[PDB]
Amino acid sequence: SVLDIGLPMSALQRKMMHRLVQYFAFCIDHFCTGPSDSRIQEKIRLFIQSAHNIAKHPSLYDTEVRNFSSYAENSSKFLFLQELFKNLSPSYSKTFFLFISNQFLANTLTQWLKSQNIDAELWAEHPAIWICVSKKAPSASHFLQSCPDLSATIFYDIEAYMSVTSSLPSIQSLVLRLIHLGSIEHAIKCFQSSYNASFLVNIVGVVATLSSSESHSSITEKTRDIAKNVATWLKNGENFSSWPLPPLMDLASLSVAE
Amino acid sequence: SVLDIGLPMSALQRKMMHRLVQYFAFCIDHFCTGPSDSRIQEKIRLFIQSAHNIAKHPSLYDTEVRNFSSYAENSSKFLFLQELFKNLSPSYSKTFFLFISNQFLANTLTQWLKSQNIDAELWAEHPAIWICVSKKAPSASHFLQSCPDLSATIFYDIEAYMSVTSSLPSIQSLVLRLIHLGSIEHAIKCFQSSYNASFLVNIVGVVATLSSSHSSITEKTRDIAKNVATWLKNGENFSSWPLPPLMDLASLSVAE
Amino acid sequence: LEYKRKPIPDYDFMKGLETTLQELYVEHQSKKRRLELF
Amino acid sequence: IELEYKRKPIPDYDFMKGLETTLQELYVEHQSKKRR
């Protein structure tokens, strides 16, 4: 019911992940090899947040005001969403709900999709795609009971998934998850099954290891091929049995605890 | 009763102190600004010991061995000891016991003072100066009860001081301490007073803050050595002790 | 204990993170420009 | 709650050896300027 779309990280995102782990090297080593104090755990939450942010969009660490449409350069997620509707065309007529755990990106995405002639707009307490800030999920749940006849759901990021799943009752609709390969999102996916005492330790450890796919051309190719496949899939009545994507590779062997 | 001899650190030592604090930056900041766990404290012990080692001699971080005479180059403690006995001459006839908390440096010190024709020897069990390892203090105590008539004591490093002071009873002869200005030795000296719970945090914090000249170092050390020697010749009068006390570092405290 | 002062005056963990991540962003921009010219 | 620890998060990370190294690295690179 809940399906993952593995999308590759850009060179920039990987650099940032490498820099992040390096900056937190001591803290990660400490936290992942034994009992740690409350303040260490506080700092690990900042590590996790930063990793989420990089996985959402690297330009969350741009200081300057930038021209919308600058952005799809370094995000497989933006490119995916573009190429999906590009190959979905005006034939398809189901209403998408997209959840994203960042106000700025919600605005930028919404404006950028319009720019490419896609009927997208922000949610608030009928279009081709609603763009919903995960904070404003409490309202959308009401309207995700009525349109289960025709309403598909995309999670831009795992943070939004974490947030929306816990707050709202389990959703009766098609759920797509955009998950960056090798990111914290991937790690959270592989240790979702637990949420035990070793959950934080493992997702940090795996991410740390991974940050201790290829180039721009190849990323674009892969992203389009994934986008074409998913679109084609949605056109043909969203068969569970003919889902065309391989699942995310399991990272359990890279665990550090339990 | 304990008379401190503040000696300046070399450029190398200050660099190593700067590198040390830089390497431990996250750990120091964490430890000194809030509650910390057992394992943080354990890693801080390594910072503290490294700081002692630098204060003892930077050559503890030499990968290869080396021949004496190279050592005084970077330690004002070595220089100080040369100049003391040089200027003390064959006139003075009281026996010194130097305590040091490193075997390699004890050997190196003896073999360098022997190099400058100072009657120095390693303590196994009368000469100008006995170079004794702090580990072997429990033996010297017995003999620091009979010669109080004429036996002075030099502590080369603060570890040597702490180890010997406690393990033995109160030494009722002269006590000199070699303490590097702005080092962890200075810091320990200032925060000795309390014997409490903000101790580690303060010595680490103070040293961190202070770590965030060749010919002049040589001059000052020479002057200090001459003054102490002069002072010893004149019957070690209390009211004429020539050196200023170590400056108070309480204002740089991070806690309590 | 009561913590009246920072041990390393210029050190700030949380702030240095933002700095280094943002500093990397601008490094990429320069690399992007350099590629576009050459 | 207590955990069994399988692996290091950063495989090549060694805090103690990195200290040993960097301090010795500084020492010998100071000897370079002694020559120079």
Author numbering:
A (entry chain A): 132 to 198, 216 to 273, 281 to 367, 394 to 439
B (entry chain B): 132 to 198, 216 to 273, 281 to 367, 396 to 439
C (entry chain C): 429 to 466
D (entry chain D): 427 to 462
Q: Would you copy out the relevant sentences from the publication that reported this structure?
A:
The conserved shelterin complex caps chromosome ends to protect telomeres and regulate telomere replication. In fission yeast Schizosaccharomyces pombe, shelterin consists of telomeric single- and double-stranded DNA-binding modules Pot1-Tpz1 and Taz1-Rap1 connected by Poz1, and a specific component Ccq1. Here, we report the crystal structures of Pot1DBD-single-stranded-DNA, Pot1372-555-Tpz1185-212 and Tpz1425-470-Ccq1123-439 complexes and propose an integrated model depicting the assembly mechanism of the shelterin complex at telomeres. Overall, our findings provide valuable structural information regarding interactions within fission yeast shelterin complex at 3’ ss telomeric overhang.
After an extensive screening of deletion mutations, we identified a construct of Ccq1123-439 with a deletion of residues 199–215 (Ccq1123-439 Δ199–215), which could form a stable binary complex with Tpz1425-470 and produce high-quality crystals for structural studies. We determined the Tpz1CBM-Ccq1TAD complex structure by the SAD method at a resolution of 2.4 Å. The Tpz1CBM-Ccq1TAD complex structure reveals a 2:2 stoichiometry and buries a total of ~2,100 Å2 surface area in the complex. The Tpz1CBM-Ccq1TAD complex exhibits a butterfly-shaped architecture with two Ccq1TAD molecules as the ‘wings’ and Tpz1CBM as the ‘antenna’. The two Tpz1CBM polypeptides adopt symmetric conformations and each Tpz1CBM contains an N-terminal loop and a C-terminal helix, which respectively interact with the two Ccq1TBM molecules in the heterotetamer complex. In the center of the Tpz1CBM-Ccq1TAD complex, the two Ccq1TAD molecules mediate a dimeric contact in a head-to-head fashion, burying ~500 Å2 surface area between the two monomers. In the Tpz1CBM-Ccq1TAD complex, the N-terminal loop of Tpz1CBM adopts an extended conformation, meandering in a shallow, acidic groove formed by helices α2 and α10 as well as the C-terminal end of one Ccq1TAD molecule, primarily stabilized by a panel of electrostatic and hydrogen-bonding interactions. The Tpz1CBM polypeptide makes a sharp turn at Asp438 and Tyr439 so that the C-terminal helix makes direct contacts with the other Ccq1TAD monomer in the complex. The hydrophobic portion of the amphipathic helix of Tpz1CBM fits into a long groove formed by helices α1, α3 and α4 of Ccq1TAD through extensive hydrophobic contacts. Collectively, we conclude that hydrophobic contacts at the interface are the major driving force underlying the Ccq1-Tpz1 interaction.
